[PDB]
């Protein structure tokens, strides 16, 4: 009981010290930017591959879907003139 509370109190103290070391930061800044340059490289290369793979398949389907949308805009405009 006494040993359980002394460990819970110390764990809260270390938790406050961990929240204090994090709030001060937000040498070290150069490492984070380089970590992003790895990400930017790795991720955006994946993005560009995912994009161009999708684009090849989906730019065709976009045109298919987008040229169909233009048909609603003319199917509507005629609708009103006929109702009128």
């Amino acid at each position: 009981x006494x040993x359980x509370x002394x460990x819970x109190x110390x764990x809260x103290x270390x938790x406050x010290x961990x929240x204090x070391x994090x709030x001060x930061x937000x040498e070290s800044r150069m490492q984070h930017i380089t970590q992003g340059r790895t990400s930017m490289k790795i991720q955006f290369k994946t993005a560009m591959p995912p994009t161009e793979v999708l684009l090849e398949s989906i730019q065709s389907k976009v045109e298919s879907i987008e040229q169909l949308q233009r048909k609603l805009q003319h199917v509507q405009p005629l609708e009103q003139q006929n109702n009128e």
Partner: protein, 58 residues
């Protein structure tokens, strides 16, 4: 007023540019780019999983 004046309110043109060896301000701006790029790469994964099936269904 926006339509009459013919001017749209400016959005956050910040995430795109940034700069390395900045300060505490660019430390934030850098950390923003990471989390959104991870969200981006996760947001491209669930699209490619289905792929063209989700598009042709619509």
């Amino acid at each position: 007023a926006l339509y009459t004046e013919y001017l749209k309110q400016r959005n956050n043109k910040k995430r795109r540019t940034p700069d390395f060896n900045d300060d505490d301000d660019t430390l934030f701006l850098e950390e923003y780019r990471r989390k959104y790029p991870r969200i981006d790469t996760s947001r491209y994964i669930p699209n490619e999983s289905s792929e063209v099936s989700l598009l042709g269904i619509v």
